[PDB]
Amino acid sequence: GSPEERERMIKQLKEELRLEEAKLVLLKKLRQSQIQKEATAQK
Amino acid sequence: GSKAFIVTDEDIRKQEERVQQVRKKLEEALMADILS
């Protein structure tokens, strides 16, 4: 049943989880960045 | 312009909820190191 394979998936999902969350946190900052003083940068 | 990108409060919530689900499978699948 390749037990290691099951554990490997967890590790892989763990890495993507951090990256996936990172973007989420950044997105939140963008929302608050458009509230104060317009949004300076258009991108 | 119209083809611009605007982030909505809800759209953001759906993103967080989706991620939360992934974590669940992480801690859950991890909590079964001996069970599974």
Tab-separated table of N, CA and C in Angstrom:
chain	number	residue	atom	x	y	z
A	1	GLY	N	0.859	-1.217	0.000
A	1	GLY	CA	0.000	0.000	0.000
A	1	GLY	C	0.879	1.246	0.000
A	2	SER	N	2.175	1.048	-0.221
A	2	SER	CA	3.114	2.164	-0.247
A	2	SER	C	2.733	3.210	0.796
A	3	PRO	N	2.894	2.882	2.050
A	3	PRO	CA	2.568	3.806	3.174
A	3	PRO	C	3.294	5.143	3.048
A	4	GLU	N	4.511	5.104	2.516
A	4	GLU	CA	5.300	6.319	2.349
A	4	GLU	C	4.605	7.278	1.387
A	5	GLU	N	3.944	6.722	0.377
A	5	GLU	CA	3.245	7.540	-0.607
A	5	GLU	C	2.194	8.413	0.072
A	6	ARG	N	1.486	7.834	1.038
A	6	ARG	CA	0.456	8.571	1.763
A	6	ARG	C	1.070	9.746	2.517
A	7	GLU	N	2.207	9.500	3.161
A	7	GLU	CA	2.886	10.546	3.918
A	7	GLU	C	3.437	11.615	2.980
A	8	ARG	N	3.917	11.185	1.818
A	8	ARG	CA	4.480	12.115	0.846
A	8	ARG	C	3.435	13.139	0.415
A	9	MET	N	2.212	12.671	0.187
A	9	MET	CA	1.131	13.557	-0.230
A	9	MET	C	0.899	14.645	0.814
A	10	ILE	N	0.973	14.264	2.085
A	10	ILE	CA	0.772	15.217	3.170
A	10	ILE	C	1.843	16.302	3.134
A	11	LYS	N	3.089	15.890	2.919
A	11	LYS	CA	4.196	16.837	2.863
A	11	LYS	C	4.021	17.796	1.691
A	12	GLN	N	3.644	17.251	0.538
A	12	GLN	CA	3.444	18.068	-0.652
A	12	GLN	C	2.331	19.085	-0.421
A	13	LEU	N	1.215	18.616	0.130
A	13	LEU	CA	0.083	19.494	0.404
A	13	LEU	C	0.472	20.563	1.420
A	14	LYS	N	1.410	20.223	2.298
A	14	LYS	CA	1.859	21.159	3.322
A	14	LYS	C	2.567	22.349	2.684
A	15	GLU	N	3.418	22.068	1.702
A	15	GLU	CA	4.163	23.123	1.026
A	15	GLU	C	3.213	24.041	0.262
A	16	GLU	N	2.351	23.443	-0.555
A	16	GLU	CA	1.392	24.218	-1.334
A	16	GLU	C	0.470	25.010	-0.412
A	17	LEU	N	0.214	24.463	0.771
A	17	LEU	CA	-0.656	25.126	1.736
A	17	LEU	C	-0.067	26.472	2.147
A	18	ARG	N	1.236	26.489	2.404
A	18	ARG	CA	1.909	27.718	2.809
A	18	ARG	C	1.850	28.753	1.691
A	19	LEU	N	2.150	28.316	0.471
A	19	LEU	CA	2.125	29.213	-0.678
A	19	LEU	C	0.704	29.693	-0.951
A	20	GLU	N	-0.254	28.778	-0.844
A	20	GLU	CA	-1.652	29.117	-1.083
A	20	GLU	C	-2.130	30.152	-0.071
A	21	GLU	N	-1.708	29.988	1.179
A	21	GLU	CA	-2.097	30.916	2.234
A	21	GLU	C	-1.398	32.259	2.048
A	22	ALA	N	-0.109	32.209	1.726
A	22	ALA	CA	0.664	33.427	1.519
A	22	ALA	C	-0.087	34.387	0.601
A	23	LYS	N	-0.544	33.874	-0.536
A	23	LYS	CA	-1.279	34.694	-1.492
A	23	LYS	C	-2.543	35.258	-0.851
A	24	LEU	N	-3.213	34.433	-0.052
A	24	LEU	CA	-4.439	34.859	0.612
A	24	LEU	C	-4.171	36.065	1.507
A	25	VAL	N	-3.141	35.959	2.341
A	25	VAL	CA	-2.774	37.056	3.228
A	25	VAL	C	-2.450	38.309	2.422
A	26	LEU	N	-1.694	38.133	1.345
A	26	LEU	CA	-1.320	39.258	0.494
A	26	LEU	C	-2.563	39.919	-0.094
A	27	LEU	N	-3.513	39.098	-0.529
A	27	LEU	CA	-4.746	39.612	-1.112
A	27	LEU	C	-5.467	40.518	-0.119
A	28	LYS	N	-5.487	40.105	1.144
A	28	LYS	CA	-6.145	40.886	2.184
A	28	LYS	C	-5.517	42.272	2.290
A	29	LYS	N	-4.190	42.320	2.237
A	29	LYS	CA	-3.478	43.590	2.314
A	29	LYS	C	-3.864	44.490	1.145
A	30	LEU	N	-4.065	43.883	-0.021
A	30	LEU	CA	-4.436	44.640	-1.211
A	30	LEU	C	-5.778	45.335	-1.005
A	31	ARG	N	-6.705	44.637	-0.355
A	31	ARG	CA	-8.029	45.191	-0.103
A	31	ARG	C	-7.933	46.422	0.793
A	32	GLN	N	-7.092	46.335	1.819
A	32	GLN	CA	-6.919	47.447	2.747
A	32	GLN	C	-6.032	48.525	2.131
A	33	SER	N	-5.289	48.152	1.095
A	33	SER	CA	-4.387	49.090	0.438
A	33	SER	C	-5.158	49.986	-0.527
A	34	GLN	N	-6.361	49.555	-0.892
A	34	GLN	CA	-7.187	50.321	-1.817
A	34	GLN	C	-8.171	51.201	-1.054
A	35	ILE	N	-8.218	51.023	0.263
A	35	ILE	CA	-9.129	51.797	1.097
A	35	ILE	C	-8.508	53.140	1.465
A	36	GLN	N	-7.245	53.107	1.879
A	36	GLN	CA	-6.544	54.329	2.258
A	36	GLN	C	-5.923	54.991	1.031
A	37	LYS	N	-5.970	56.319	0.996
A	37	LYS	CA	-5.409	57.064	-0.125
A	37	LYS	C	-5.562	56.274	-1.421
A	38	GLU	N	-6.731	56.389	-2.044
A	38	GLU	CA	-6.994	55.680	-3.292
A	38	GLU	C	-6.274	54.335	-3.304
A	39	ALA	N	-5.371	54.163	-4.264
A	39	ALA	CA	-4.619	52.918	-4.377
A	39	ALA	C	-3.262	53.170	-5.024
A	40	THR	N	-2.813	54.421	-4.977
A	40	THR	CA	-1.526	54.783	-5.560
A	40	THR	C	-1.277	53.991	-6.840
A	41	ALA	N	-0.633	52.836	-6.700
A	41	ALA	CA	-0.339	51.994	-7.853
A	41	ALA	C	-1.626	51.435	-8.452
A	42	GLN	N	-1.680	51.382	-9.779
A	42	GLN	CA	-2.860	50.868	-10.465
A	42	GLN	C	-2.734	49.366	-10.696
A	43	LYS	N	-1.562	48.821	-10.384
A	43	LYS	CA	-1.322	47.394	-10.563
A	43	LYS	C	-1.057	46.723	-9.219
B	1	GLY	N	-10.521	49.835	-16.642
B	1	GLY	CA	-11.846	49.923	-17.318
B	1	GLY	C	-12.727	48.763	-16.870
B	2	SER	N	-13.703	48.411	-17.700
B	2	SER	CA	-14.608	47.313	-17.380
B	2	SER	C	-13.834	46.008	-17.231
B	3	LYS	N	-12.839	45.814	-18.090
B	3	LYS	CA	-12.029	44.602	-18.044
B	3	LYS	C	-11.049	44.658	-16.876
B	4	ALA	N	-11.356	45.496	-15.892
B	4	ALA	CA	-10.493	45.639	-14.725
B	4	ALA	C	-10.737	44.503	-13.737
B	5	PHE	N	-9.892	44.422	-12.715
B	5	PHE	CA	-10.026	43.377	-11.706
B	5	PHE	C	-10.372	43.981	-10.350
B	6	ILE	N	-11.515	43.581	-9.802
B	6	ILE	CA	-11.950	44.092	-8.507
B	6	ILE	C	-12.184	42.943	-7.531
B	7	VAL	N	-11.507	42.997	-6.388
B	7	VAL	CA	-11.653	41.959	-5.375
B	7	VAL	C	-12.846	42.256	-4.471
B	8	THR	N	-13.701	41.256	-4.281
B	8	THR	CA	-14.883	41.423	-3.443
B	8	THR	C	-14.653	40.811	-2.065
B	9	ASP	N	-15.412	41.279	-1.080
B	9	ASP	CA	-15.273	40.778	0.282
B	9	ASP	C	-15.638	39.298	0.349
B	10	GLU	N	-16.701	38.923	-0.355
B	10	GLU	CA	-17.154	37.538	-0.355
B	10	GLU	C	-16.134	36.640	-1.049
B	11	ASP	N	-15.805	36.977	-2.292
B	11	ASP	CA	-14.842	36.193	-3.057
B	11	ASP	C	-13.643	35.824	-2.191
B	12	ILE	N	-13.233	36.750	-1.330
B	12	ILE	CA	-12.096	36.510	-0.449
B	12	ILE	C	-12.429	35.430	0.576
B	13	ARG	N	-13.632	35.504	1.138
B	13	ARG	CA	-14.061	34.528	2.132
B	13	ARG	C	-14.031	33.119	1.550
B	14	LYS	N	-14.528	32.977	0.327
B	14	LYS	CA	-14.550	31.676	-0.333
B	14	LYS	C	-13.136	31.125	-0.479
B	15	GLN	N	-12.171	32.021	-0.650
B	15	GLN	CA	-10.779	31.611	-0.804
B	15	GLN	C	-10.232	31.067	0.512
B	16	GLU	N	-10.560	31.743	1.608
B	16	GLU	CA	-10.100	31.313	2.924
B	16	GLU	C	-10.739	29.982	3.307
B	17	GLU	N	-12.028	29.844	3.016
B	17	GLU	CA	-12.746	28.616	3.336
B	17	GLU	C	-12.142	27.430	2.590
B	18	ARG	N	-11.782	27.652	1.330
B	18	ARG	CA	-11.195	26.594	0.516
B	18	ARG	C	-9.876	26.122	1.120
B	19	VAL	N	-9.052	27.074	1.545
B	19	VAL	CA	-7.764	26.744	2.144
B	19	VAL	C	-7.960	26.006	3.465
B	20	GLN	N	-8.907	26.479	4.267
B	20	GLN	CA	-9.182	25.858	5.558
B	20	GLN	C	-9.487	24.373	5.385
B	21	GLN	N	-10.195	24.041	4.311
B	21	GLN	CA	-10.556	22.653	4.045
B	21	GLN	C	-9.305	21.808	3.826
B	22	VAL	N	-8.347	22.355	3.084
B	22	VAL	CA	-7.107	21.640	2.805
B	22	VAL	C	-6.363	21.334	4.100
B	23	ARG	N	-6.262	22.333	4.971
B	23	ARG	CA	-5.573	22.158	6.244
B	23	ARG	C	-6.196	21.012	7.035
B	24	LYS	N	-7.524	20.962	7.050
B	24	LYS	CA	-8.231	19.909	7.771
B	24	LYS	C	-7.686	18.538	7.384
B	25	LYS	N	-7.575	18.296	6.082
B	25	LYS	CA	-7.055	17.024	5.593
B	25	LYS	C	-5.596	16.849	6.005
B	26	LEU	N	-4.930	17.963	6.290
B	26	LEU	CA	-3.526	17.920	6.683
B	26	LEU	C	-3.388	17.455	8.128
B	27	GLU	N	-4.041	18.168	9.039
B	27	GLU	CA	-3.976	17.823	10.455
B	27	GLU	C	-4.664	16.487	10.712
B	28	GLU	N	-5.775	16.256	10.018
B	28	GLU	CA	-6.522	15.016	10.182
B	28	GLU	C	-5.703	13.828	9.689
B	29	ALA	N	-5.241	13.910	8.445
B	29	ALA	CA	-4.447	12.833	7.864
B	29	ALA	C	-3.145	12.653	8.638
B	30	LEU	N	-2.676	13.732	9.254
B	30	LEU	CA	-1.435	13.684	10.020
B	30	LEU	C	-1.680	13.082	11.400
B	31	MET	N	-2.859	13.348	11.953
B	31	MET	CA	-3.202	12.840	13.276
B	31	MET	C	-3.378	11.327	13.241
B	32	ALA	N	-3.382	10.765	12.036
B	32	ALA	CA	-3.550	9.325	11.876
B	32	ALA	C	-2.240	8.678	11.440
B	33	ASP	N	-1.130	9.182	11.970
B	33	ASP	CA	0.181	8.642	11.632
B	33	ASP	C	0.257	7.158	11.983
B	34	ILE	N	-0.405	6.779	13.071
B	34	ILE	CA	-0.407	5.388	13.506
B	34	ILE	C	-1.722	4.711	13.133
B	35	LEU	N	-2.802	5.487	13.137
B	35	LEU	CA	-4.113	4.954	12.788
B	35	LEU	C	-4.148	4.530	11.323
B	36	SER	N	-3.536	5.338	10.464
B	36	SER	CA	-3.500	5.035	9.039
B	36	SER	C	-2.081	4.685	8.600
